[PDB]
């Protein structure tokens, strides 16, 4: 019933502007007049859906296209029929240009070969699309010759567009406002030929992410998924303004700039360029990876003797053969890309990773047969929408978290603007919709950031993407669905709010000059000072703990990862010192230990405040070991013994003894 | 075509009809593999002026489809039927030639350079059989005589028919009819207008 109401809404606000999809594949075959011509012709003739109406419209479309089409090689023949008869109907792609020297409108026919036909001002001003890229029309060409004349004798008397003539902004926005967000989303999903009722809402958001490149200028996105997930259909059959670089062998001369022909590459002619079969991408010229890096950086690339700007949006469609979890644990999910482009900065360019594995394989229950938007209509919708911007709509409701640097801000802003353009072209939207689009953008950006982390190490560790509400000041953290190494440990403590939380400390030790650096401490001055005190104790107690390892000859950085979102942690001296000892000695901290307590600069350990909740968190974390001070021994009776029974407790005397207990 | 209907079985007549099917269908990709002397290529070189036969096995991508230098459409834009004889000789200088062929025979149009061009030409692959059909079935796939460069499931899947070239007997005079037949280009223009 709801889909029927959608049909009436489309007929009310998109009259003669939408059409179903089964007739399209029925007429598909291979003859001529590409698909959007076919479906516009269906939309204009077939108005209702009476079986007789449908069948008669189909037959009329087929007979018209079979009777008034002209193939190129016989084109001259048609001219003769025009001369002897005086008038003749022809299907052809017409493009109109203004001859200022003669001050007349001059139409040219791509197939017929006429390059100087005269066309009246009324016809050209009626259909402005004649002046943009030329359209297939039915035209009644007439012949009238005068001796000594200069104008071509061929003139157009009647012209009916077989494609769309125009799109009006106001009726478009009114029709969008006439439907709910779910209705509009399902309308676009049906427009590609997908049945939204057969796909989960998250798959619907992924599909919308697939249309995001078409609407945002200079947008980079990569999607990898299993075979037959329908990645390439959108970029091949669903747009006359997108291109799919097949074969993997693309040349920077062909792609960016052929300095031999002084012609800009593909990035200058199409709104969306997509590389299928990314594993097959191999560049004969060494510049390819770096030129792509620069173009993604600015949208402008320098070649030969000119800087060229291009707004083409870049898509990387790839196939995965293994399971998701296998690649997650054993590698990075950006694995299918060729080794030549496996670089931190190159994947730093990307604004989104679309999870093609979450896309189920296509199966005609997934293919809608209801009313949908015309592919030409939707494509020129995207083309017009590219001129606008909703990127500043984010600041009204949310502020970005501090874990996203300038580029992450840019990526999430572009993605949120794209989703805003797709779902709310009218410009009126609520705070919840901004929430939803922002969280999806943050998900994809964080996914890319995790891949960058796994590839490059330190410089992409700040992956805790979050957004703060302007009103409630509440921060929402968004994540992804998908023998500890030396310097890696766990600690449980109260946050600044006083609630127990578990945090992972990671120490990276390289050769250096004894410097210490911190990250992930939530800019807590007390936490940084605790870390500094711990490192001072480590430098002072190097002989006792390391037995000869030189702290001065190595540089250290420690990072804190929050697992329970409890808040910033203040006490960090003991876990930091344990991290120093583990990293420098290269001995793995014993599995399932949590380092607790705090230590002062003099080496005095402090009891673990609220040891009961801390050890309960340790149990809930999956641990089996606890390191505790003797001062918490008096706190032993306050916890039920059964909670202790799941841990092999190890107490320590001083921070050095804590090191010895942790390392075993 | 010059064959004797009374001297051929009905199944062989159906096979010969399948041989002329590409002349009426747009972008009909069909592969026939048969023994020598079975008259596979006669229909494709003598019985139609809208069909072209490419011999030598070596041909360039631009020549068939579109030339960057001269900006003119290739053979696919000039003939209704393009027939590659001696399929064992098929070799392409560019590695993307296989990919552009796949895109063409899949969609009827190819995007080369910056432009996408349509073509209704139907593509045929005519090859020679060297080994018995039973042994070929037992030991390999029937498309083995194609060179390894184009032995691909995706490449073959665009094919709409594999004509049994072994079933048609080797051409002999009693197979060459001497009765009244339709004019050669009468039938060819019939095919073109259908």
Automatic annotation (TrEMBL), chain A:
Q: Does the keyword Hydrolase apply?
A: yes
The UniProt record lists the keyword Protease? yes
Q: Any idea which UniProt keywords this protein has?
A: Hydrolase, Plasmid, Protease
Record's protein name: Protease Lon-related BREX system protein BrxL
Q: State the organism named in the record.
A: Acinetobacter sp. NEB 394
